[PDB]
């Protein structure tokens, strides 16, 4: 039959969440950043945003086909109806999930914590970010856990602008002695129409138009046209 609108919306949200979790677990190593689900008559297009699209596709597309089939089998879409693209992020430096994955696989590669964090920070700043903050917590040195914070630029924390001016990601790193937690926050620059950042300005920012230089008429001149 059919279900209520409330249940339908909750259900498609649940589907999106599970799909994103599975795609994360599958393509974290390939710079996975997110999934977009587009429903069109008799078709469902799944766009996977990743930094390394060729690794996501695999050789001759094999990997992507596998993924499609797996989705087809899991969520019970009719055979041949679901399909999966794969695109690249516009700016990797401004995606906190991508930077968190980069830091994760840097730490998994034996790189020292401070070197990796400072490199990620500098790459984010060089990408045009207004500011960023990277926190790594856990057994960094010895048996006692500690936290380690790296900040640069401007970073807001309160109010509604935090929901569209700063992008946040939290990730786990499985090391020999235990889990390291990494948190990456990027404060996006104000972008008027062009997606490097939000279109709306910060609510407390007031810009005053510079008055043009006029010359006061000394005498009444009448111009006939």
């Amino acid at each position: 039959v059919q279900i209520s609108k409330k249940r339908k919306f909750v259900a498609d949200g649940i589907f999106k969440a599970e799909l994103n979790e599975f795609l994360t677990r599958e393509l974290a190593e390939d710079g996975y950043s997110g999934v977009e689900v587009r429903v069109t008559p008799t078709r469902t297009e799944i766009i996977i945003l990743a930094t390394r699209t060729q690794n996501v596709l695999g050789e001759k597309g094999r990997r992507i086909r596998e993924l499609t089939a797996v989705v087809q089998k899991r969520f019970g879409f009719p055979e041949g109806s679901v399909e999966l693209y794969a695109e690249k992020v516009a700016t990797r430096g401004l995606c906190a999930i991508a930077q968190a994955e980069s830091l994760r696989y840097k730490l998994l590669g034996g790189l020292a914590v401070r070197r990796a964090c400072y490199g990620v920070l500098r790459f984010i700043m060089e990408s045009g970010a207004k500011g960023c903050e990277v926190v790594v917590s856990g057994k960094l040195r010895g048996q006692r856990a500690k936290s380690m914070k790296f900040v640069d630029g401007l970073m807001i924390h309160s109010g509604d602008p935090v929901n569209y001016y700063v992008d946040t990601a939290v990730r786990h790193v499985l090391l020999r002695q235990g889990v390291l937690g990494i948190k990456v926050k990027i404060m996006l620059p104000w972008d008027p129409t062009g997606k490097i950042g939000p279109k709306k300005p910060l609510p407390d920012h007031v810009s005053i138009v510079e008055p043009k230089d006029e010359i006061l008429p000394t005498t009444p001149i009448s111009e006939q046209k």
């Binding site: 020292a112 914590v113 401070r114 070197r115 400072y118 960094l140």
Partner: peptide, 25 residues
């Protein structure tokens, strides 16, 4: 080396502080 500055800044007073300071100069 930047790695020396990092390892020193992590523990400015530690088992490896003197060696890293000597390396920095």
């Amino acid at each position: 080396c930047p790695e020396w500055m990092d390892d020193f800044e992590a523990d400015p007073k530690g088992k490896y502080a003197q060696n890293l300071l000597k390396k920095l100069i």
